[PDB]
Design a protein around this ligand. Structure first.
Ligand code: BEF
Ligand SMILES: [Mg+2]
Length: 124
């Protein structure tokens, strides 16, 4: 588990990207960059050579679910682990993200404790 892997934090809420960034720093990860919607994340992922994606769901531009499908439906981006963070706690929606290929999930609000937990869970 590289602690200097390039990570993209996607969320329409700036403060949330901010919180995620610091929790990640707390766990020994400071190579984070941001995108405020799935529409701005894609082009970044398209040439940024990121290693990990943490994405919100509910986003006006391109919903987090659609972003993961684009990442998956893309031969150069389909190995990217994706942790979905979001308020949508409905099982039917978690299922949907699972079928779409997400690697992990985590419901807002969460702590550094819970985050690290999820991260380790993901690396496979
Ligand atoms: F905006 Be995410 F669905 F919390
Ligand atoms: Mg949102």
């Amino acid at each position: 588990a590289n602690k200097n892997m390039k990570i993209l934090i996607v969320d329409d809420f700036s403060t949330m990207r901010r919180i995620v960034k610091n929790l990640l720093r707390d766990l020994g990860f400071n190579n984070t960059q941001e995108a405020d919607d799935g529409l701005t994340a894609l082009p970044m992922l398209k040439k940024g050579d990121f290693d990990f994606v943490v994405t919100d769901w509910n986003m006006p531009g391109m919903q987090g679910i659609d972003l993961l499908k684009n990442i998956r439906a893309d031969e150069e981006l389909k190995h990217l682990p994706v942790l979905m963070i979001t308020a949508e706690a409905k099982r039917e929606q978690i299922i949907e993200a699972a079928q779409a290929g997400v690697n992990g999930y985590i419901v807002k609000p969460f702590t550094a404790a819970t985050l690290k937990e999820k991260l380790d869970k993901i690396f496979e």
